[model samples]
Target: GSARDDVLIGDAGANVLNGLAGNDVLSGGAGDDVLLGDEGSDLLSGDAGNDDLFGGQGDDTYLFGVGYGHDTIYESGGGHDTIRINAGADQLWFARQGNDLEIRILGTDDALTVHDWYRDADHRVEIIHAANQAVDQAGIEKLVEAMA
Candidate 1:
């Protein structure tokens, strides 16, 4: 798919690209654009812009980095998607808004938080690097405090 201002990419196979809201869907592949998963285990990444990703269904992974525009992720139902934020030296803040959890990245307004992870003790938010490997779990204690 072409580099667009903002849109969604999809295909019968799948591609990894992120754009604004234009319905540009593709099969999964490899790219550094902001993309949203329609169904099944989808992998989405938001890079270099204020992006919004919606996890339609199935398990999914969303990634984010610093210096990017404020990013927002919307996940509902039983969609167990993991969001990895790679913010170096940036702090995370968790707040409860009437049964809803809102996460904030201190450096900037770029952030995303899901109630599923906070409410479900079995679901502890984990942070990972761009390499997809688990990192320090120390932040989890702070997460638990915020969630509690």
Candidate 2:
């Protein structure tokens, strides 16, 4: 979409891009723009920004901050972004509220963590396979025993 000359994006400035999936939508603020929406989509954006995007094709990345109610994308070993299990995945909040800020490697990508990996308070991490990526037969047996 096009914007009025007065409210056009900066000739050269930092611009932000956001992408939503699964019945998503897209809209361009303006200026040399390219926007797309894949699946059920809807995007509402500014009226003055240099934008190039895709709804569900190829690779277009948006590095964003994840919070307790966030984290929708998963980075693969190939640096490709995919969908993340919002619930099954863990979230770390901080004791100081703001202390929730660190970095951890997910799959193969280093993503910023709101708190330390092992911090019990605002941070709760499970290696997933019951927080143990390494397979352990004894562990499984112990789990069965605990259940019994």
Candidate 3:
């Protein structure tokens, strides 16, 4: 894409969309896709597939909606990053798989995995937006604890 703000959209096939530099928006329509925000704050959404999102630098936002496939986020910290869940808090389930954090939507196969979440501070999300509430890392940990 451009070095300025850009909007990148992908189709049904497995696609790779990269925002080189700048605050950008990348949407993966369907099929497994790879969305990379190389620099600057960006918004990434894998609309319907098992996608991999990499926020290389700057504050980034990942959006997940209902029926979206399993998605994974790889954030190389530069600034605070957030994950926005388009679902009610009661419908969200949190669990730990190895060093990663897994978020599952109840009654659906949709899920998101934050890679190296527990093991690396740089990979951890700064906030989670769900159901008109903002949850911090501690809140997420408490939720995971409750599951134990």
TM per model?
A: 0.51, 0.19, 0.97
- Worst lDDT 10-window in candidate 1: 23-32
Q: Give a tens-digit lDDT track for model 3, residues 6-119.
A: 999999999999999999999999999999998999999989979999978899999997978899999898658999999999999999999999999999999999999988
| 1 or 3, greater by lDDT | 3
lDDT of each: 0.49, 0.29, 0.93
Q: What TM-score, to 2 decimals, does candidate 2 have?
A: 0.19
> lDDT tens digits, residues 1-148, model 2?
1221111222233343334343333333334344333322223222233333343332222222222112222111112212222221233111222333233333433233323323432232222231313213343234334443
- C-alpha-based local distance difference test score of model 2: 0.29
After superposition, which runs of candidate 2 have C-alpha atoms over 4 Å from their true positions?
Answer: 1-14, 32-50, 57-148
Better model by TM-score: candidate 1 vs candidate 3: 3
Off by over 4 Å in 1: 1-35, 77-80, 88-90, 113-148
lDDT of 2 at 2: 21
The window of 10 residues in a row where model 3 has the poorest summed lDDT is 74-83
- For TM-score, candidate 1 versus 2, the one ahead is 1
Query: What digit string (tens of lDDT, one per residue) describes model 1 on residues 84-139?
Result: 76754336565555544555667675656444444553333344333344443355
Q: Of the pair 2 and 3, which is ahead by lDDT?
A: 3
